[PDB]
Amino acid sequence: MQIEVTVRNITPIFSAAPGSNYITIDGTINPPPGVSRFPLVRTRMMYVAADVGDGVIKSVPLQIVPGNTMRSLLRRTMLKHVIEPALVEKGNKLSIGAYATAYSGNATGNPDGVPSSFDEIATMRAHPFIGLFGGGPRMLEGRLMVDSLYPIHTNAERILGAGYENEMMSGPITQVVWARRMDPILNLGSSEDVEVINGGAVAANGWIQDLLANSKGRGLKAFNAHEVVIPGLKWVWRISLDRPTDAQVGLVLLALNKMTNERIAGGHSKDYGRFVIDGVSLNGEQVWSQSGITGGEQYFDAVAEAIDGLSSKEFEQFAQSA
Amino acid sequence: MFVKQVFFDLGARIHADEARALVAKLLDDTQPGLVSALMNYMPASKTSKTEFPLVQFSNFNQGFALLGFGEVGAQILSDATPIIHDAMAKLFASRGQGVVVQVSSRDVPLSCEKRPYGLQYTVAKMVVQKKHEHRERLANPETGKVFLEGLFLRSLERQAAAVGMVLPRDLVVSFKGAERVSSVKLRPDSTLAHGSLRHAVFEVNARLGGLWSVGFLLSKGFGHINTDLQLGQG
RNA sequence: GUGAACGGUGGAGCAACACCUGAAGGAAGGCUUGAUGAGCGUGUUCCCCGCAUACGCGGGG
């Protein structure tokens, strides 16, 4: 079951790579030491084979949002307003281990060395939530197969190829945005602002005096950067499912109906990662309109009678460890 | 090498000479070594060194500035800054409601190169006068330009020798124009005065770096300006 | 004229068949690039330090 979600970013997208890189004033990512480099946390990035010339492909760098991030996103939005409202609406409450297995996939770090019975796997598998997301102490397999969000870009022409004849981004698609820190005590220069302090002017002068010793216990007032994809470009997402029930597909579609208010990226204090869905292809047919998904009726009905009757006994026997 | 520049924000502008006097007054009773170093005093007596003052007071629109030339001057400023800030804190919190003393600190490097084209640099509040022979030199123009020539070149040479880097010795200067002639006094209500030049302009074929101080009475806050801002003024 | 002299360890024989390294996990929170050095006061003979060796030069406030 192939779901091709084409979206368009409203604000820019910043999904940070764990590698700590550095940047000078005008470009020069990762300079040599001794240039007074600033810290930089780049947007995360897969390489991709691309035709940069006449039929020769290179591993050009592509900045994306990873599949684990938006798998956690899709799990969190479906468990935030499709499953847990249905859990608390009829009064059932998850256990603390059941909550840990619902959100993270495991209760503790240590799993069971034993295997579970097949009747358990038959209950939890082919289910609206535990079928899609496995885990627990027995490491149950999850039906749902969440890919990363590539941009529609010429470097990703080899990915989802022989499509989008026009509307293909070819230029540079990123920007480095600088964020500086202020020390608020330093930027006062008034009595009305320091009348609020316990201690007042002498306390502010003492903290500034400590900052004088620490200028030449990490202080404030830094000036850093982050490398961020530009906004307003098309992105594609793929969701896959092997032998899915109609309730599982309906739960994915209900999460994706109201996906538009959630955060695909990090750095959400700068509102980074707002996206508007251009369309949703359900095995190639366009099912997205302005008022959510039109089409896929049986999936919505099956998840409608599936989330009713969704107790927490199954979550509790999921999270129970031998 | 580099010069350390520290700005203090007292909320109201006080001049550099009264800042030096105010700082010498408040730290007179306690901690004599740091005020002796910041005043460039003798290790045994109260008399200042005849050499280049490594640290010096300067001008600031919301307060006063301090300049420490070289590693020794930068170290002196870095050790002496928090007790100075605590002193202005207690002084401005003793009377009135109380203000907060804000700080700034920069480390401006020194550099010089030579190009075969003269360059414009202006200096304000420049003191040229210490002796009666310099009155006799400034009375006639022809023997006055050469005195200003030698003074500017030897001032560049002495600060370059003090901070520890090599000056090219093929430099030629020229003095074009003057705007005003005014006196500076040594202490308040004193009859003795020193002649001084207001808005002098000079033309040097070399490139001039920031915190480049010329003339006499450098520790009192005269004859220094940043040449980096004057180079490509925006 | 060595209880010596003279005497091939040889031939052939397939370590092989069948097993998916996996499973399930959000780099993410919080954080002014535009101010800091650029424009505004002093009116005449005085401390101290070196080179000299006083005929004077240089300079610190």
Q: What is the DSSP string of A175-241?
A: EEEEEE---TTTS--SSTTTTTSSSTHHHHHHHHHHHHHHH----S--EEEEEEEPSS-EEEEEEEE
- Answer yes or no: do B93 and A205 touch at CB < 8 A: yes
Exp. method: cryo-EM
Both tokens assigned to B64: 């006063």
Indicate if CB(B209) is under 7 A from strand C: no
Residue for token pair 């900045």: A63
What are B68's two structure tokens?
């420490």
Three-class secondary structure of residue B89 per DSSP: helix
Closest Cα in chain B, distance from residue A182 (Å): 13
Beta-carbon pairs below 8 A across chains A and B: 59
Burial class (CB in 10 A: 0-12, 13-18, 19+), B183: exposed
Q: Are B228 and B119 in contact (CB under 8 A)?
A: no
In strand C, the nucleotides that come within 7 Å of a protein beta carbon are 22-33, 35-46, 48-49, 56-61
Whole-angstrom CA distances from A124 to A105, A110, A251 are 13, 21, 15
Q: Are B173 and B149 in contact (CB under 8 A)?
A: yes
User: Residue A215: which of B86, B102, B105 has the nearest Cβ?
Assistant: B105
Residue B207: DSSP 8-state: -
What gap in Å lies between CA B185 and CA B25, rounded to an integer?
19
3-state secondary structure of B58: strand
> HSE of A270 in the Cβ direction (CA atoms, 13 Å)?
14
Which residues in chain A are contacts of B101 at CB distance < 8 A?
A: 205, 208
Residue A276 near residue A260, CB atoms below 8 Å: yes
Instruction: Tell me which residue of A163, A240, A162, A161 sits closest to A2, measured CA to CA.
Output: A240
φ, ψ at B231 (rounded to 5°)? -85, 110
- Looking at residue A169, the DSSP 8-state letter turns out to be B
Kindly report the length of chain A: 322
Give the burial class of B162: count Cβ atoms within 10 A of its Cβ; 0-12 exposed, 13-18 middle, 19 or more buried: middle
CA distance linking residue A7 with residue B158, whole number of Å: 67
In the three-class reduction of DSSP (H, G, I as helix; E, B as strand; rest coil), residue B183 is classed as strand
Which segments within A30-86 are labelled E, that is strand?
Answer: 38-43, 45-51, 57-63
Closest CA to B211 of B136, B106, B128: B106
Q: Which residue has the tokens 């909550």?
A: A99
Resolution (A): 3.0
Single-letter amino acid code for the residue at B14? I
DSSP summary character for residue A304: H
Element (H, E) at B72: helix B70-94
Burial of B142 (0-12, 13-18, 19+ CB in 10 A): exposed
- CB-based contact B89 A202, cutoff 8 Å: yes
Nearest CB among B89, B98, B100 relative to A188 is that of B100
CA–C1' distance A17–C29 (Å)? 15
Nearest chain B alpha carbon to A206: B86
The answer to whether residues A119 and A135 touch, using CB atoms and an 8 Å cutoff, is: no
- Name the nearest CA neighbour of B209 among B114, B109, B126: B109
- Interface list for B 13-72 with A (CB within 8 A): 62
Name the residue closest to C47, CA to C1'.
B47
Pairing of strands A292-293, B2-9: unpaired
CA proximity to B156, closest of B134, B178, B180, B172? B172
With contacts defined as CB-CB under 8 Å, which chain A residues touch B103? Answer: 186, 208, 211-212, 215
CB A74 within 8 Å of CB A49? no
Residue entry with tokens 């906004």: A231
Instruction: Report the candidate in B204, B203, B150 with the shortest Cα–Cα distance to residue B177.
Output: B203
Instruction: Determine whether the distance from the CB of A133 to the nearest atom of strand C is below 7 Å.
Output: yes
- In whole angstroms, give the CA distance from residue A231 to residue B132: 73
Q: Which residue is nearest to nucleotide C45 (CA to C1')?
A: B192
User: How far apart are the C-alpha atoms of A195 and A198, rounded to whole Å?
Assistant: 8
DSSP 3-state of A38: strand
| Separation of first and last alpha carbons in chain A | 35
CB A258 within 8 A of CB A81: yes
Torsion of CA A167, A170, A171, A174, to 10 degrees: 80
- Contact between A186 and B102 using a beta-carbon 8 Å cutoff: yes
Strands of B158-231 (E only): list them.
173-177, 180-185, 193-198, 200-206, 212-213, 224-225
Chain B residue nearest residue A190, CA to CA: B99
- Interchain contact B102–A (C-beta under 8 A): yes
> Which positions ≥6 away from A53 have C-beta within 8 Å?
none
Query: In Å, how far from its chain's centre is CA A299?
Result: 25
Residues of B in contact with A190 (CB under 8 A): 100
Asked whether A65 and A44 are in contact (CB, 8 A), the reply is: yes
